[PDB]
Amino acid sequence: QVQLQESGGGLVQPGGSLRLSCAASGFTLDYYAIGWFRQAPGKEREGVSCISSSGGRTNYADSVKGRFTISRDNTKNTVYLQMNSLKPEDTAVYYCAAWEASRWYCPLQFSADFSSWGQGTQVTVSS
Amino acid sequence: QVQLQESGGGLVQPGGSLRLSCAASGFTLDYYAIGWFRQAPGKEREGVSCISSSGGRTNYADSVKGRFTISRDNTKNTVYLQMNSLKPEDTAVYYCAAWEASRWYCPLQFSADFSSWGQGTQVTVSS
Amino acid sequence: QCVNLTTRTQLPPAYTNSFTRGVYYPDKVFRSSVLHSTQDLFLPFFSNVTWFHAIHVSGTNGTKRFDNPVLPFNDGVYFASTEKSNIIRGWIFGTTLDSKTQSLLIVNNATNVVIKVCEFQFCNDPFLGVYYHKNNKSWMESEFRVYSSANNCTFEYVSQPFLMDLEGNFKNLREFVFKNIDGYFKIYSKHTPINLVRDLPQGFSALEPLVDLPIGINITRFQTLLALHRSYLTPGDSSSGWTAGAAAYYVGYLQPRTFLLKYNENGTITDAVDCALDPLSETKCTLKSFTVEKGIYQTSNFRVQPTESIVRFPNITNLCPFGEVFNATRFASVYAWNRKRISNCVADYSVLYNSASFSTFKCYGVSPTKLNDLCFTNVYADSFVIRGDEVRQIAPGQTGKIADYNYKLPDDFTGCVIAWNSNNLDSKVGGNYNYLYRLFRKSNLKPFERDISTEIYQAGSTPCNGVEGFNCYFPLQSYGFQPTNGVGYQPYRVVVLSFELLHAPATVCGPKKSTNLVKNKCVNFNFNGLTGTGVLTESNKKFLPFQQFGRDIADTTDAVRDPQTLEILDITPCSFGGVSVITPGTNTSNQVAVLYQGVNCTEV
Amino acid sequence: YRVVVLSFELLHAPATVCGPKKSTNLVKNKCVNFNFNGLTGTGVLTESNKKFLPFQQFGRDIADTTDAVRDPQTLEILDITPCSFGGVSVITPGTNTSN
Ligand SMILES: *[C@@H]1O[C@H](CO)[C@@H](O)[C@H](O)[C@H]1NC(C)=O
Ligand SMILES: *[C@@H]1O[C@H](CO)[C@@H](O)[C@H](O)[C@H]1NC(C)=O
Ligand SMILES: *[C@@H]1O[C@H](CO)[C@@H](O)[C@H](O)[C@H]1NC(C)=O
């Protein structure tokens, strides 16, 4: 019954701002770290932004630093992100993955198994 | 204070899975043999499946053979039905009934007295 | 409407002493010439209470500002008022004092009293703007500035004022007791003329009951309502307020206490004694009289309650070959699974969880956090390199190619499925095709069934006879595990542990919490499962090597063998006894002496 | 048509609305079954000169037995006494002499 759902995708203008959320049902998300990934038309799925189980460790790709802010609420069991100053390079399908790190360290710089995946949502930036 | 309570009913997709639990309060359920029974809209109370007091003997309906699973926990005083590869023919109200073998021979495939009954839980399969 | 005032600046608390007050009629009965003992919520004698000026001038300039903190309400409140000019006017009760939780107001104007409970929006400084009239001045007009709005009103009450009019040293004392039990807001009241006493006067005064109210709300915090004679727009240099708040209000907190009340032939409480104050009072309570004769009496008992806990329990050297499975080199193929048996070992499941290395953590039948606590009979381990999108199909009550054809998972599964990847270890550039997977089988399997037969399945009507061809395929296809494959196509090292909970002897158990050793102090101890309370002392007894415990002639444990350290420890139950009070007649002296029977004078 | 609906709240909550019903006329000096404001008992009611406090409704003996009760109509506290229980003894000589 583990289910992951996106909320907040849609069409915006370059330079604008929007907020995306991954909610879940069937289990608790405080134990898991949650990452955000994106698949562009004709491009592979890249790592957009990761946050730890407790939220104290975060990862941003170099292309997404300073425009994206990742966060989570463990009490209501959801994970948020805020993007500002959007670009046409950010239009794509978008996914939230909840899993546990695979190596001996606190950060989330590296990639690993991606336990649970939602159906994703579309984010479009064009004007 | 003899109470038999059904729980776990709900709406599921055909081909999915579901679990139903029958719990006993006010009496010991290990001494009784317990059968899950059903009534569909416009049909009669047909014997779905049964398990003996010790759990060493079980009977199934040919309509549920190979897809259903009956078991019991006599320490926790409860009986379980797991439900796999669901078909739209599996929407109905499901009761759990506890009785004693009212005839010779160990198996419980015949129908008999059902001295104790529950209130029933709805299981709907439709998509 | 409410008007903002200046900051309270958190004035320091100040204390004074309450001398035998707060005594209210505990019930509604008539008693004549009798001594009655009651256990209920009251003000302790010689208790230390917090006192606030109505107006304080604490600034160097001379700023006149109120002392109106919102104070906690625990099990009732005693509120005393030494006042002269009718400046305290009401009270607010509730938990949040906002538009979120219901709140109660009591207010007292010149005519009657107004009591409500509604959903008030309360400001930071509620108050009553009180002004006299230009001709009469006999009474005063009050403008309420206590709440912004009120909704969902559930009570209303109007009756004779609680506070009498006070319109140059006839200060008077209003003593009030407010309690909340079982949806009951009870107010007991009394007033008394005071003369030349700044603090509470010394003496006694029965406090009569005034009202009970069925409000039935939760109240934890409260505030004091006070009256502005001056103007907030134009605060005067001095004397605009009332003698810089010489009128004062005292707050005391009630506790469950026992009292011996003496009803006279009038049914007026003329004297009371609290049982917990001093041994003389304890003797008076236990003897049920206000006078005790010369002698010795027994009041209560002490037990020296233990101060901490200790547990010790032996840890075996060998743990498990978990590292032989989880950290193995070569793994089994999915068609020929590798069950491994684990028994006669202590299983460390905290290691696997604290590893923070496995992606999926799903234990069914057992909560993840409690594997180390409860232990089982036998353990079976499997761990494989399945594809990523075929990971979710290892949990009972599921459908899928592996979930349907390869290995069934019974619904009544007590165990764990714990998974991660095997990319850098089980993938190769040319692809690792040593893992063979089945897609065709004649029929579905049973739980925990193993088939390794390599017979060619007949997709059509003609028989294959062990030979491939048209409508004939080999059972096993190899995966292209490459380090460049996507998340789902990656190799995935997944583990399934099946545990056995039976009415059978347990051979696998979890790690055991062992603590440090404390001696010559009363402690709760748990040795090898024996729990008790005692003091552990070094013992000279010699145990034979196969013995563990020791009992006295009366079937009480007295000696024990420490598992880790092979010393032998004896147990003495923690010293207790009775308490006795030596006292002469109360008509001669009020000092007493205490004697503790059958104990040593160190634990006191 | 002028319509009034009266909704009564019957919960585990204090009762502020009650029916005085019939104020049964006072019948004293004969031990009756009495029910004063919820107290149910048996005994004889007599005029008593004690004074209850205005809030007090009960009078207690040294033990738990209640003795005096305040009349809600007109105060004049009445006191209660259980009405003369006892025991019967038979004084007889030997039955072989006389019956
Ligand atoms: C009252 O205050 C003094 C010191 O300020 C303190 O010794 C005493 O404990 C206080 N009263 C109570 C009941 O604690
Ligand atoms: C007993 O009652 C009267 C009122 O009737 C009261 O004024 C009096 O002082 C009381 N007696 C004593 C000794 O207090
Ligand atoms: C215990 O009592 C004895 C007297 O019988 C005394 O000598 C000893 O010092 C006491 N020990 C403690 C710890 O109080």
Strands A121-125 and A10-12: parallel
C404: left (phi over 0), alpha (psi -120 to 50) or beta: alpha
Q: Which of D47-53's residues contact partners 24+ apart within 8 Å by CB, and which partners?
A: D47/D76, D47/D78, D47/D79, D48/D77, D48/D78, D48/D79, D50/C30, D50/C32, D50/D77, D50/D79, D51/C267, D51/D77, D52/C30, D52/C267, D52/D77, D53/C25, D53/C30, D53/C208, D53/C267
Could you tell me if B41 and B93 are in contact, meaning their C-beta atoms sit under 8 angstroms apart? no
The dihedrals phi and psi of C351, each to the nearest 5 degrees, come to -65, -45
Cβ under 8 Å to B: C residues 390-419: 396-399, 410-412
The span from the CA of C271 to the CA of C260, in Å, is 9
C77 alpha carbon, distance to own chain's centre? 23
**Segment holding C108, helix H or strand E:** strand C103-108
Q: Which of C576, C543, C589, C585 is nearest to C562 (CA)?
A: C543
Beta strand residue intervals within chain A, DSSP E: 3-7, 10-12, 17-25, 33-39, 45-51, 58-60, 68-73, 78-84, 92-99, 116-117, 121-125
Residue A9's alpha-carbon distances to A5, A90, A118, in angstroms, are: 11, 12, 13
For C56, half-sphere exposure in the C-beta direction (CA atoms, 13 angstrom radius) is: 21
Nearest to C214 among D16, D51, D60 (CB): D16
**Segment holding C282, helix H or strand E:** helix C279-287
The span from the CA of C425 to the CA of C596, in Å, is 73
- The residue type at B123: V
> For residue A104, which residues of chain C lie inside 8 Å, CB to CB?
356-357
Could you tell me if B30 and B77 are in contact, meaning their C-beta atoms sit under 8 angstroms apart? yes
Residue A63's alpha-carbon distances to A59, A66, C163, D88, in angstroms, are: 12, 9, 72, 109
Task: Calculate the dihedral angle through the C-alpha atoms of C116, C120, C124, C125, rounding to the nearest 10 degrees.
Answer: -30
Q: Which of C380, C315, C371, C374 is nearest to C343 (CA)?
A: C380
Residue with structure tokens 């670009």?
A87
Q: Which of C214, C232, C110 is nearest to C164 (CA)?
A: C110
DSSP assigned state of C574: P
The span from the CA of C518 to the CA of C523, in Å, is 8
DSSP string, C131-188: EE-SS--SSEEEEEEEES---S--EEEEES-SSPP------EEEEEEEEEETTEEEEE
Residue C116: CB atoms within 10 Å: 19
Strands D58-60 and D66-69: antiparallel
Residue C491's alpha-carbon distances to B105, C152, C496, C514, in angstroms, are: 52, 62, 16, 40
Q: Is C3 helix (H, G, I), strand (E, B) or coil?
A: coil
Nearest to A102 among C359, C361, C486 (CB): C359
The span from the CA of D5 to the CA of D8, in Å, is 10
Residue C261: CB atoms within 10 Å: 19
| Torsion sign across C-alpha atoms C242, C244, C247, C253 | positive
Could you tell me if C298 and C281 are in contact, meaning their C-beta atoms sit under 8 angstroms apart? no
Length of chain A, please?
A: 127
The β-bridge partners of C257 are: C40
Could you tell me if D39 and D69 are in contact, meaning their C-beta atoms sit under 8 angstroms apart? yes
The span from the CA of C52 to the CA of C44, in Å, is 20
DSSP assigned state of C405: I
The span from the CA of C57 to the CA of C60, in Å, is 8
Residue C219 in tokens: 């109240």
Could you tell me if A47 and A60 are in contact, meaning their C-beta atoms sit under 8 angstroms apart? no
The span from the CA of D51 to the CA of D56, in Å, is 10
Q: How far is the CA of C19 from the centre of ligand 1 (A)?
A: 14
The residue nearest atom 7 of ligand 3, judged by CA position, is C600
The span from the CA of D71 to the CA of D57, in Å, is 9
Nearest to B82 among C397, C399, C444 (CB): C397
Instruction: Kindly determine whether residue B66 and residue C398, on different chains, have CB atoms separated by under 8 Å.
Output: no
DSSP string, C73-105: --S-EEEEEEESS--EEEEEEESS-STTS-EEE
Q: Is C370 helix (H, G, I), strand (E, B) or coil?
A: helix
Residue C163 in tokens: 């506070």
Q: Which of C92, C126, C131 is nearest to C110 (CA)?
A: C131
- The residue type at C335: Y
Instruction: Kindly determine whether residue C357 and residue A99, on different chains, have CB atoms separated by under 8 Å.
Output: no
**Segment holding C122, helix H or strand E:** strand C122-132
State the count of interchain CB pairs (< 8 A) between B and C: 22
D53: left (phi over 0), alpha (psi -120 to 50) or beta: beta
Could you tell me if C218 and C117 are in contact, meaning their C-beta atoms sit under 8 angstroms apart? no
* Ligand closest to the CA atom of residue C520: 3
State the count of interchain CB pairs (< 8 A) between C and D: 37
Q: Which of C359, C357, C350, C348 is nearest to C510 (CA)?
A: C348
Cα-atom radius of gyration of chain C, to the nearest Å? Answer: 40
Could you tell me if A32 and A54 are in contact, meaning their C-beta atoms sit under 8 angstroms apart? no
Mutational test site, ligand 3, from C599, C600, C603, C604, max ligand atoms within 8 Å of CB: C600
Sheet of strand C340-342, all strands in order from the earlier edge strand to the far edge: C340-342, C379-387, C491-499, C415-421, C360-364
Q: How far is the CA of C265 from the centre of ligand 2 (A)?
A: 8
Strands B17-25 and B116-117: unpaired
Q: How far is the CA of C571 from the centre of ligand 3 (A)?
A: 17
Q: How far is the CA of C266 from the centre of ligand 2 (A)?
A: 6
Q: Burial, C285: exposed, middle or buried (Cβ in 10 Å; 0-12, 13-18, 19+)? A: buried
The span from the CA of B106 to the CA of B88, in Å, is 33
The span from the CA of C67 to the CA of C224, in Å, is 9
The residue nearest atom 12 of ligand 1, judged by CA position, is C48
The span from the CA of A82 to the CA of A68, in Å, is 6
- The residue type at C414: T
The span from the CA of B14 to the CA of A127, in Å, is 44
Q: Which residues line ligand 3 (CB under 6 A)?
A: C 600-602
The span from the CA of C297 to the CA of C320, in Å, is 64
Q: Which residue of C has its CA nearest to A107?
A: C356
The residue nearest atom 6 of ligand 1, judged by CA position, is C48
Could you tell me if A123 and A21 are in contact, meaning their C-beta atoms sit under 8 angstroms apart? no
The span from the CA of C491 to the CA of C503, in Å, is 39
**Percentage helix, strand, coil, to 5, in chain D?**
0, 25, 75
Instruction: Give the list of residues 6+ apart from residue B9 with CB closer than 8 angstroms, or none.
Output: B18, B20, B94, B121, B122, B123
| Torsion sign across C-alpha atoms C113, C116, C120, C125 | positive
Nearest to C421 among A31, A45, A112 (CB): A112
Asked if B82 is an interface residue toward chain C (Cβ–Cβ < 8 A), one would say yes
Residue B48's alpha-carbon distances to B51, B122, C535, in angstroms, are: 11, 15, 62
The span from the CA of D65 to the CA of D52, in Å, is 17
SS (H, E, C) D12-49: CCCCCCCCCCCCCCCCCCCCEEEEECCEEEEEEEEECC
Residue B111's alpha-carbon distances to B63, B101, B106, C326, D77, in angstroms, are: 16, 10, 13, 50, 74
Q: Is B38 helix (H, G, I), strand (E, B) or coil?
A: strand
The span from the CA of B78 to the CA of B72, in Å, is 6
How many helices (H) and strands (E) in chain A?
0, 11
The span from the CA of C45 to the CA of C179, in Å, is 18
Q: Burial, C348: exposed, middle or buried (Cβ in 10 Å; 0-12, 13-18, 19+)? A: middle
Q: Is C532 helix (H, G, I), strand (E, B) or coil?
A: strand
With contact defined as 3+ CB pairs under 8 Å, the chains touching B are C
Residue C59's alpha-carbon distances to B29, C297, C404, in angstroms, are: 77, 57, 82
Could you tell me if C135 and C58 are in contact, meaning their C-beta atoms sit under 8 angstroms apart? no
Largest Cα separation within chain B, whole Å, is 44
Chains D and A touch (3+ CB pairs under 8 A): no
* Ligand closest to the CA atom of residue C48: 1
Asked if D48 is an interface residue toward chain C (Cβ–Cβ < 8 A), one would say no
